[PDB]
Subunit: 115 residues, 4 copies
């Protein structure tokens, strides 16, 4: 698994479950082309988005649908989503974990990159 | 000044000075149109982006050029930039501060909505 | 004012108002002796804790009563408080801002050391 | 495993490896009595600190030795340590993951609590 996404809820102290996540890759023509998408599991993890063959060099954007998450929970949050944008595989394949911690008016995001 | 941006550097424990910030408003065709931009000051703050009469309800994107900031310091960074996307909602008089705390592989952002 | 504390609320997207903050200095026998304290203001800020002549090098603990803050809002919190422990080092003229961003089950803190 | 600690490095985008962690429990007499201690593994995780029999109700403090971590890496950080203090098992046994994300002048910490 070259790309994994982990999301936690800082209000509840729990995994953020059933969060939609869409991944895009910047195309030749500068557009954001759809790449893969999925939903976080009961452990707040999203696996199986892609494969080492598919996950080529490029600029990727991982958009986490934090607004739908808070709304499903009856809360009106500030951000539309949380998007993480990075160049991947510049020096060869790496494994990327994108972790996000969500509050209604705040989020943070970190990347763990291993070889 | 209904919209201010403040950026701090978690590695040096200082304001993040001279960071480029571009603000876009979502247009009816779903493209992002330039709205306002500037460089943060010596105090990591960016004032005077817009006025109340110009700043109407809508979806806005604040893009912070974290990549250039880290490179100008000789530090290798993960993210291409940091994008903060939110709906400006008239519910009240409504000053928005978008604050961001930067690390090479991580950032956080919070909104402080007052008055 | 060589030492200031600023606290924000990530759930409401506001300053954290009226939060109790106690500052201790580590004594030679390793106990924490009271040094300064106060409640954050309407802007989530706490000024006037100490003066340059009183604030000597040493280890200081800043304890932020996050538990009372959440309870006064009717929100269930995880941490008993937030403690920020650091060495004040004369290397330069040296204003310290200790900033904290609070969630029910999470907080972050950053130091901004300027001048 | 009732108590686990996970630490990440936000500068490198990696697990924070070989971080010392000491756990204390507030005694009858209001003192912090040593409870368990360990070091994070190659994955930045610390397992096996305690058992469901040992990990009784109480107020616990998990002190993460972030200063030694940065120093080993040739860096002079701001904080002495990062301490997390919480009441555990008030409504019966729970499993607690204390996660911390470290930068030289900043850290955040979150708790994931599951039943
Ligand atoms: C950077 O975002 C922040 C993150 C955290 C959690 Cl560490 C607390 C406060 C923050 O915002 C500020 C921090 C310092 C100053 Cl001087 C001003 C502001 Cl608005
Ligand atoms: C933004 O994500 C994180 C933020 C912080 C700062 Cl408190 C710490 C860890 C984070 O990522 C995780 C948090 C908990 C688990 Cl179990 C796993 C991961 Cl990868």
């Amino acid at each position: 698994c070259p790309l994994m996404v982990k999301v936690l809820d800082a209000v509840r102290g729990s995994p953020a479950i059933n969060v939609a996540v869409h991944v895009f890759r910047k195309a030749a023509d500068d557009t954001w082309e759809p790449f893969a998408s999925g939903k976080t599991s009961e452990s707040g993890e999203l696996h199986g988005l892609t494969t080492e063959e598919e996950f080529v060099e490029g600029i990727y954007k991982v958009e986490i649908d934090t607004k739908s998450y808070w709304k499903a929970l009856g809360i009106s949050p500030f951000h539309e989503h949380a998007e993480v944008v990075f160049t991947a595989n510049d020096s060869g394949p790496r494994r990327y974990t994108i972790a996000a911690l969500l509050s209604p008016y705040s989020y943070s995001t970190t990347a763990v990159v291993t070889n």
